[PDB]
């Protein structure tokens, strides 16, 4: 996408403080709790019946970590998200059949998680920068659908 250098440095700085494994597990878990229809892709994962079951489910945590790790790696290529995520885009379409609306939902939950985590440090300008990034990633992941 297009971030001003001050937006880019805002995103970069905050992300250096993120425990990717922890935030990943939290974001995926909250996605499954707040928007329960997203559970549709994960019934191989065990008990998802209550909020506590979802948040404590080890498969959810593991997958959350895998997703946010790929997300992390994309922050290093903000200039070319589409190229970075082309293969994953294809995979999510052809093999996993994930409606790309799910990427948008996850992006918004991730922003809530960052806000919860960082409190007042997650200022309005920083949120704005992260919104552009998550929209960009969702875009990039949806790009090769057909």
């Amino acid at each position: 996408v297009h971030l001003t250098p001050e937006e880019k440095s805002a995103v970069t700085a905050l992300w250096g403080k993120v425990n990717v494994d922890e935030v990943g597990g939290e974001a995926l878990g909250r996605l499954l709790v707040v928007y329960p229809w997203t559970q549709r892709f994960f019934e191989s994962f065990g008990d998802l019946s209550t909020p506590d079951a979802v948040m404590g489910n080890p498969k959810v945590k593991a997958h959350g970590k895998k997703v946010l790790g790929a997300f992390s790696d994309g922050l290093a290529h903000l200039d070319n998200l589409k190229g970075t995520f082309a293969t994953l885009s294809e995979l999510h379409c052809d093999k996993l059949h994930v409606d790309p609306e799910n990427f948008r939902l996850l992006g918004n939950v991730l922003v809530c998680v960052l806000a919860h985590h960082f409190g007042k440090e997650f200022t309005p300008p920083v949120q704005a920068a992260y919104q552009k990034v998550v929209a960009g990633v969702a875009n990039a992941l949806a790009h090769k659908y057909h």
Binding site: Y35, W37, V98, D99, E101, N102, A142, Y145, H146
Partner: protein
Amino acid sequence: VLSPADKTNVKAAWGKVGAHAGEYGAEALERMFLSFPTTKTYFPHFDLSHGSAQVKGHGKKVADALTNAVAHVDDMPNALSALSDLHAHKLRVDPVNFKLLSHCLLVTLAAHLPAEFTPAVHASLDKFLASVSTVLTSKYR
């Protein structure tokens, strides 16, 4: 909220659809799969090629449910109760897709009811499809 005039408009239009309801249902699906390819992610188990029996069959089911909703427009939540359970707990289609199908249904009706599809009827039909969509997503959480 459907006004009495909206209900009259929907019954009149759907009345003229009559026996073609199933054929129009299939056409709307095909329009949706071509115009909004993301919707195909919910049908990986179907042959989505043109004229496929699976799509025609599904189109007929969708159309019959809408027929049921028109017949019970004053009591839709009850009439569609089983269908809202099915979409909420089983199928779990993201709510945004209901809009997409609604639009394609509207286009299909427009293409087949030249005389019936007045501005006022168009408005009533869009309202009606939004209400059906609201009921079908009622129990998602």
